[PDB]
Amino acid sequence: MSSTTLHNAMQYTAFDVLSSILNLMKADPLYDLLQLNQAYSSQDQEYEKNEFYGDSYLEERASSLVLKFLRKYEQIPFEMYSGLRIHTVKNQTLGEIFDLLHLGEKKKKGDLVESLIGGCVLLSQRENATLFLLFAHALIDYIFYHSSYIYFNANPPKLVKEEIITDIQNWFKDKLFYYRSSLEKYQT
Amino acid sequence: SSTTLHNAMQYTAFDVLSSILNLMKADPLYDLLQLNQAYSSDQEYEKNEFYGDSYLEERASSLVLKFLRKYEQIPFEMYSGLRIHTVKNQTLGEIFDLLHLGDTKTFEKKKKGDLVESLIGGCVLLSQRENATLFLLFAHALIDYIFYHSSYIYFNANPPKLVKEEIITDIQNWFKDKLFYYRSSLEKYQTDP
Structure with missing residues (x-):
């Protein structure tokens, strides 16, 4: 009841924080990532190179977060990590x-x-x-x-x-606070 | 030449990496790696392997981009x-x-x-x-x-x-410089940890 109400609230707050950050990015002249490094690369090759890197960066950050939360609980088998x-x-x-x-x-x-x-x-x-x-x-x-x-x-x-959902929900609420305040401090 | 650099590099790499590992093995934290679990039925070893696989993938992707993107001649098929x-x-x-x-x-x-x-x-x-x-x-x-x-x-x-020959020279010179950095870091660590 509490975690499902909290989950619904977090989606609104995540949308607003990420939308606000993204809207500032769209003002930067660097925003069109695909048309950069034109002497060395092309739009389609920049797209593929960014995806090539982003895939592995996501994988590494996801792995670290899986370990961060699951290792606290020895009753959780390794198959749940993968x-x-x-x-x-x-x-x-x-x-x-x-x-x-x-x-x-x-x-x-x-x-x-x-x-x-x-x-x-x-x-x-x-x-x-x-x-x-x-x-x-x-x-x-x-x-x-x-x-x-x-x-x-x-x-x-x-x-x-319920303990691990509460762990992740409290962690994410704190990350949103930190991203919000970084964004505000950036705006000033 | 590049070929005389390559055999020398495999000698020096072995020596630097063995010397770092020899110092790690003197550290009580080495016990925590539980490499004995490679032989056994396993959990902490597999969690480290779980993370190391992703960490290797990200760092290898970073290095691929680092060297190949200078070379417009090199198409994306060679990155993957x-x-x-x-x-x-x-x-x-x-x-x-x-x-x-x-x-x-x-x-x-x-x-x-x-x-x-x-x-x-x-x-x-x-x-x-x-x-x-x-x-x-x-x-x-x-x-x-x-x-x-x-x-x-x-x-x-x-x-x-x-x-x-340019990209091989690029990577050989980079790795020779990394080996120097690792060797000098190791020597500094030994004297005053």
């Missing part, structure tokens, strides 16, 4: 996030999300674009929150389902 | 080809054998790759959970060597248009 990671990075999950954020086919949606994540991280390493890195971190955190909440409702662990 | 070549079990087994990490014949090709991934994962996690920075140094040096070794083979088997 299960949750698979669930977090599959195109269906990415496409659900694509739709919740109104960024726009399930295969295409997942590729676009990965290319966006990769493009944002890379841009922040090659240019002055720390806002893009903030967006990529917040997007991945929402992907993990969204995936975890669904996965543990479908596959509850013995005894601790 | 080089990455697959770098992280596949065959390559990690070759690294297992080159560093003499365990018995070459009793371990299977797949077990060798799992051990390399579990070693990478446990080392990174130990540095995150206990500030064991020597373990993080080793993880980076091992991934750098996996990438050097893979990339050298890959581009000699699949030469890109025009820039074959």
Whole structure:
């Protein structure tokens, strides 16, 4: 009752934080990631290279978050670690996030999300674009929150389902606070 | 020449990586890697392998982009080809054998790759959970060597248009500089940890 009401609230707040960050990014002249590095690359090759990187970056961050929350509970078998990671990075999950954020086919949606994540991280390493890195971190955190909440409702662990949902919900609420305040401080 | 650089590089890589690992093994935190579980029915070893696999994939992707994107001659098929070549079990087994990490014949090709991934994962996690920075140094040096070794083979088997010798020189010079960085870091660590 409490966790389901909280879950509904978190979707509104995540939408507003990520939408606000993304709306600032769209003002930056660096926003069209696909038309950068024109002497060395092309639009289609930049798209594929950003997706190539974003896929692996998402996988590594998802793995670290799976370990962060599950290792606290020895009654959780290792098959749930692989299960949750698979669930977090599959195109269906990415496409659900694509739709919740109104960024726009399930295969295409997942590729676009990965290319966006990769493009944002890379841009922040090659240019002055720390806002893009903030967006990529917040997007991945929402992907993990969204995936975890669904996965543990479908596959509850013995005894601790409610403890681990509360762990992830409290963590995500704190991340949204930190992304909100970073955004505000950025606006000033 | 590039070929006299390559054999020397495999000598120096072995020595630096063995010397870092020898120091890690003197640290009580090494016990926590539980590499004995490679032989057993398993959980912490598999959790480290779970993470190390993803950490290797991300760092290898970063290195692929780092070197290939300077070369417009190199098309995207070689990015995914080089990455697959770098992280596949065959390559990690070759690294297992080159560093003499365990018995070459009793371990299977797949077990060798799992051990390399579990070693990478446990080392990174130990540095995150206990500030064991020597373990993080080793993880980076091992991934750098996996990438050097893979990339050298890959581009000699699949030469890109025009820039074959340039990209191999690029990667060899980079790895020689990394080995110097790892060696000097190790010496600094020994004197005043």
